[PDB]
Amino acid sequence: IVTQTMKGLDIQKVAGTWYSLAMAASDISLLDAQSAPLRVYVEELKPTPEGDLEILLQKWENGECAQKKIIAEKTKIPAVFKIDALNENKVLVLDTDYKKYLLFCMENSLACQCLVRTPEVDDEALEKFDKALKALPMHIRLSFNPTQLEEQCHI
Amino acid sequence: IVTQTMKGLDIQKVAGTWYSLAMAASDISLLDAQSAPLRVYVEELKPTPEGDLEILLQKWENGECAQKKIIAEKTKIPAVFKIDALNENKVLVLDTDYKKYLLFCMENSLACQCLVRTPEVDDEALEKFDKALKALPMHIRLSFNPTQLEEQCHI
Ligand SMILES: CCCCCCCCCCCC(=O)O
Ligand SMILES: CCCCCCCCCCCC(=O)O
Ligand SMILES: [Cl-]
Ligand SMILES: [Cl-]
């Protein structure tokens, strides 16, 4: 869709803790319920020495907040990773300063998130998020407060 | 919250057909499911000679798309109406050109909609909607395509 990627991305520097501060998707049903397919809350990024990205996340599964670990395998493009699915899906990093915020989208139909390092509404990062979204066909946008950010599955 | 109201509002001129093109709310759960409390789709406005506003809407009730009629009673302020509830709730008209778009919010916790006259994504009206929202503490925003606009309960 989806032509904002980060130049010069250093994947090692996105390691560590993240909070899904805001989420957006092209279909309401991708994000509408707690158990909706793309309602996933990022907990931690672990880039591997190969330069694959391991993702720890929470997803509300059947009546509970399950912890999931997913591998995004690297591509020829440093800002684009691949997740193995049914068929499968690209993760693109649009923008990050490493230390405060990271924007990314998953496509294939589309969902994007604004990730932040701390449980804080980051006005700057949310501006960047909305700007990157105005380019995209989004029909639902969610945002979470600092209290929900400290809760499992933002409950 | 909620300090954008329309000056010189002529309530007779909002009569007729409307489409809820976009919705936003301060709590995700006010809009998340089809049966969520403020997921209501405006069908028609009928101002009465007294200057009360009769509202025809659809709401997804128990497994189906119910038609509801609600009366918003006028106040001293032309752009502000009152709905009788458990306790009760103000409707404010923020902005309208009568002929294309109308923005309104309901408060008491808060939901706003961008209404349009035709089943068309109105880029102008959506700009106005987002501008009026940046002032407000919104955590979910929904938008509907022209196909869903022609469907009962936007299904
Ligand atoms: C910088 C990469 C950000 C992490 C991308 C998250 C991808 C999650 C894909 C969701 C699939 C699933 O959980 O079933
Ligand atoms: C210009 C006025 C726009 C109409 C305002 C809609 C108010 C709907 C309130 C929802 C309450 C309910 O349906 O139970
Ligand atoms: Cl939908
Ligand atoms: Cl919530």
UniProtKB/Swiss-Prot annotation, chains A, B:
Domain of life: Eukaryota
A Pfam cross-reference name: Lipocalin
Annotated tissue distribution: Synthesized in mammary gland and secreted in milk.
Effect of substituting Q58H: In variant C; found only in the Jersey breed
GO CC aspect terms: extracellular region
Record keyword Disulfide bond present: yes
Family annotation (SUPFAM superfamilies): Lipocalins
Keywords: Allergen, Disulfide bond, Milk protein, Retinol-binding, Secreted, Signal, Transport
Keyword Signal: yes
Annotated family: Belongs to the calycin superfamily. Lipocalin family.
Subunit-level organization: Under physiological conditions beta-lactoglobulin exists as an equilibrium mixture of monomeric and dimeric forms. Interaction with LMBR1L which mediates the endocytosis of LGB has been observed in PubMed:17991420, but not in PubMed:23964685.
The protein's role, per its UniProt record: Primary component of whey, it binds retinol and is probably involved in the transport of that molecule.
Name the record gives this protein: Beta-lactoglobulin
Natural source organism: Bos taurus
Name of the gene encoding the protein in the UniProt record: LGB
